[PDB]
């Protein structure tokens with residue numbers, strides 16, 4: 335009689351929105367977690383709206399729904415693509431158990447109480463290996479808190495060494511000391527804003543910001559260092575002649591492999607514009623001649 | 624305690640099934656309930672979290688072979704504007720050649736229209752050739768910046784409106800040269816304390832030599848700026864306000 339209740343699990347497991355490859359393979363506790371989280375899921379969905387291979391694939395990050403009590407009630411399938419950890423392994427469980435603990439207070443705050451949220455978290459990654467040997471991975475998380483419940487997208491930032499995607503002419507690349515001082519720049523830099531890298535080698539990046547941006551950026555630098563990666567808000571960089579060009583950068587700390595000491599920041603820089611105020615000269619560097 | 628929370632599970636499991644809330648049985652009732660029932664909703668889910676919408680375009684003609692309705696909440700744009708269209712039209716003109724390059728997997732940022740444009744992160748991939756992707760939305764006085772010495776290293780454009788000088792004329796020169804001689808030590812010791820007092824703001828007032836050579840009373844409030852890693856301070860930032 336145990337025999338069958340056990341087998342009843344199987345029909346249940348199967349007719350979750352999961353393939354039998356991933357439905358069949360379950361100890362029951364899992365099936366519990368899962369059934370319920372699915373329900374709750376459907377519930378708040380109803381609370382919102384008052385063949386789908388493409389959304390999933392088109393994505394570069396995954397969606398998570400989490401209670402205010404931290405329970406990761408929903409998780410995208412393709413999370414495994416990014417985190418390795420497969421949605422079945424996680425749903426129902428507390429976020430904190432899988433997030434870097436120092437980053438948890440931040441987590442706690444964004445969970446609670448403008449309903450808008452944007453922050454970075456380090457989460458366990460196993461891509462592939464097992465969890466004991468699970469290294470941390472930064473997720474840019476962007477979403478909305480609702481009724482308490484947090485709904486987000488978690489976009490891994492990508493690592494400049496290991497490209498998954500093509501670049502275009504309006505993208506250039508730069509290397510910087512921890513100081514943010516340039517150490518390297520590709521010479522699309524020239525094509526794009528006018529500076530020749532030999533000029534900018536000795537220089538802290540800070541000299542090229544338009545000021546309004548500075549603050550927005552400082553936090554970014556800080557986050558770049560506490561977590562090891564960042565995506566900047568959009569900001570203006572001063573072009574070599576007057577005016578500036580809008581920008582967004584993916585900062586990524588690279589370590590010395592033999593040394594495990596950090597070496598520099600690798601910046602994927604995205605130029606969003608042409609020079610806007612050719613007319614206006616802002617800083618002493620644009621003034622020569 | 625496996626059992627007690629096994630029964631927690633099964634308890635509120637029971638209670639969200641409406642025609643139920645009103646072991647083996649709770650279970651197969653939930654099952655049939657699934658049978659009665661992650662797709663079009665998923666759309667709204669994106670719209671909520673990412674604030675995004677999906678679209679597909681031919682690689683060659685850049686013609687929108689599909690645009691989700693969520694384009695409208697997202698761009699304040701009808702689908703019709705968009706499915707009769709070629710995407711080169713729906714973006715900022717200076718964004719075009721980038722796109723040619725983007726037209727494996729794809730991702731980029733771009734100004735799309737709602738002459739008013741918005742920043743949009745787009746993530747997708749190529750399938751037959753077309754591109755499946757999602758578009759997402761992520762978001763009196765003047766300001767100066769000085770070296771410790773007092774030299775103008777940065778100036779806001781509106782300087783021209785506030786003091787008559789063009790940026791070129793300020794830049795390079797020590798601020799204390801534009802100061803009324805009387806007030807100069809006032810300015811200097813203000814600066815020293817600004818550095819001694821790292822990061823904190825001090826205000827000071829003084830007559831400023833206008834391009835029309837006029838002593839313009841001005842308060843400025845300012846602070847040294849520490850590097851977030853090293854905490855060493857490279858520049859001072861002033862906001863210099865006409866009084």
Ligand SMILES: O=[N+]([O-])c1c(Nc2cc(F)cc(Cl)c2)ccc2nonc12
Pocket residue numbers: 508509510514515516519523538539540541542543551554555558566571583585599601603
């Ligand atoms: O120099 N960095 O390492 C760095 C960025 N790169 C960069 C490239 C330029 F050509 C000019 C400037 Cl100001 C910064 C862009 C955004 C950053 N946020 O933190 N460091 C950044």
